[PDB]
Amino acid sequence: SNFGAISSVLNDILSRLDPPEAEVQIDRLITGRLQSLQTYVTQQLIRA
Amino acid sequence: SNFGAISSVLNDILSRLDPPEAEVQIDRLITGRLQSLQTYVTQQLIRA
Amino acid sequence: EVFNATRFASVYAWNRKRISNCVADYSVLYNSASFSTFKCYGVSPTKLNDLCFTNVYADSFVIRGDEVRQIAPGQTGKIADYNYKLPDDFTGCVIA
């Protein structure tokens, strides 16, 4: 998933774009992956 | 709620602004409603 | 033939030149002619050699200097609405 961005993996935007310009795309992917990880942890805690 | 935007519903910003310009406002409303839904299902799972 | 030429097309009747199966480099373009706005969206001009694209499409057209800002993914005006408009998730960039 892209989480509202132009790509999914950070290795793609880091290979085509520059870090000073694609910094907002990396931050959106990190916050998106962190939210999914937080949801999976809460689901695992309920299952536990 | 606005979730840090200029309006609450997407039909208001889509009629005054263009989708290429109000894309950040719609994305903030989506991740804002998704976070509230994640909190609601978390409370519902605890109540269940 | 793609840069520093003498005859191009219009903005509505442009040609899609097929540029494929070759070595597309950007460092060998500064010695031919000077570029005014080497702006690029969605791709960095310095990372063109590390990666490799596929079936590069060449869209050349001559416009006015006042309309140089309308060539962007998500602009509005007379070229971004009634003429060839760049897509939102558009990969690739423009040399003007």
Swiss-Prot record, chains A, B:
Outcome of substituting residue 2 to K: In strain: Omicron/BA.1, Omicron/BA.2, Omicron/BA.2.12.1, Omicron/BA.2.75, Omicron/BA.4, Omicron/BA.5, Omicron/BQ.1.1, Omicron/XBB.1.5, Omicron/EG.5.1
Superkingdom, natural source: Viruses
Effect of mutating residue 14 to F: In strain: Omicron/BA.1
Role according to the record: Subunit of the fusion protein that is processed upon entry into the host cell. Mediates fusion of the virion and cellular membranes by functioning as a class I viral fusion protein. Contains a viral fusion peptide that is unmasked after S2 cleavage. This cleavage can occur at the cell membrane by host TMPRSS2 or during endocytosis by host CSTL. In either case, this triggers an extensive and irreversible conformational change that leads to fusion of the viral envelope with the cellular cytoplasmic membrane, releasing viral genomic RNA into the host cell cytoplasm.
Protein's recorded name: Spike protein S2'
Native organism: Severe acute respiratory syndrome coronavirus 2 (2019-nCoV)
Lineage: Viruses, Riboviria, Orthornavirae, Pisuviricota, Pisoniviricetes
